[PDB]
Design a protein around this ligand. Structure first.
Ligand SMILES: CCCc1ccc(-c2ccc(S(=O)(=O)CCO)cc2)cc1[C@H]1C[C@H]1c1ccccn1
Length: 226
């Protein structure tokens, strides 16, 4: 029990309720990029001239479990192995064995100002109660030990990586991880709409391919962690 436990539970339950829903039959979501089972959608949303476009993607990744996908997404010690858009990050606070608060700065995308972010990152298993599900939620929080960074505008995020595992002695050949990934990012102040939209459209599919291939590579030949 840390001070965020109730907020974590609300965020995780909202994602389980609303984020997991299939959007294939929902014309409100625009399917923007498809590469096999990887499907990336957005809604075009602006608030006060600032792009907020919600992002939602699904993927089906052979040979890894939801638990493993979530561990590698959450574990800061492997972060620099797959992340390509981060300049710096610092763990600000350790709340629990499954929850931390992170500060990070993103590489600048000309001509917009650099952004930074301050967020809680939590990894949770949700029992079947139906598949079991593993979820990582990353969502912005306020913290006193946030640095002064005069180069950066503070973005706010609510991201979840939600994973369900299907299985046919069990082999990697017989396992598939189904991922739903959602990201709602407020860039904080102004940035050109065309730039934000092009960064999203490029960087989200690149991340999902890169990150899922990395998990496949790191786990192959290791005992399966369900
Ligand atoms: C001007 C920057 C806006 C901007 C700030 C931040 C983020 C962002 C933050 C966190 C996460 S994550 O999945 O929680 C993994 C931990 O980092 C992904 C994305 C995305 C954008 C928008 C631009 C989109 C984007 C997508 C992917 C990578 C970088 N940028």
């Amino acid at each position: 029990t840390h001070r965020f436990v109730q907020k974590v539970e609300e965020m995780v339950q909202n994602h389980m309720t609303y984020s997991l829903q299939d959007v294939g039959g929902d014309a409100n979501w625009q399917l923007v990029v498809e590469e096999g089972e990887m499907k990336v959608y957005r809604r075009e949303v602006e608030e006060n001239g600032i792009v907020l476009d919600p992002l939602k993607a699904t993927h089906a990744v052979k040979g890894v479990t939801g638990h493993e996908v979530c561990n590698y997404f959450w574990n800061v010690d492997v972060r620099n192995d797959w992340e390509t858009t981060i300049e710096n990050f610092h763990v600000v606070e350790t709340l629990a064995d499954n929850a931390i608060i992170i500060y990070q700065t993103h590489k600048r995308v000309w001509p917009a100002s650099q952004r930074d972010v301050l967020y809680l990152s939590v990894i949770r298993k949700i029992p079947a109660l139906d598949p079991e599900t593993w979820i990582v939620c990353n969502f912005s929080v306020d913290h006193d030990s946030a640095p002064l960074n005069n180069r950066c505008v503070r973005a706010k995020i609510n991201v979840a990586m939600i994973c369900q595992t299907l299985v046919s002695e069990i082999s990697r050949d017989n396992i598939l991880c189904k991922i739903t990934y959602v990201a709602n990012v407020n860039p904080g102040g102004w940035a050109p709409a065309s730039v934000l939209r092009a960064v999203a459209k490029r960087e989200y599919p690149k991340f999902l391919k890169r990150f899922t291939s990395y998990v496949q590579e790191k786990t192959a030949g290791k005992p399966i962690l369900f």
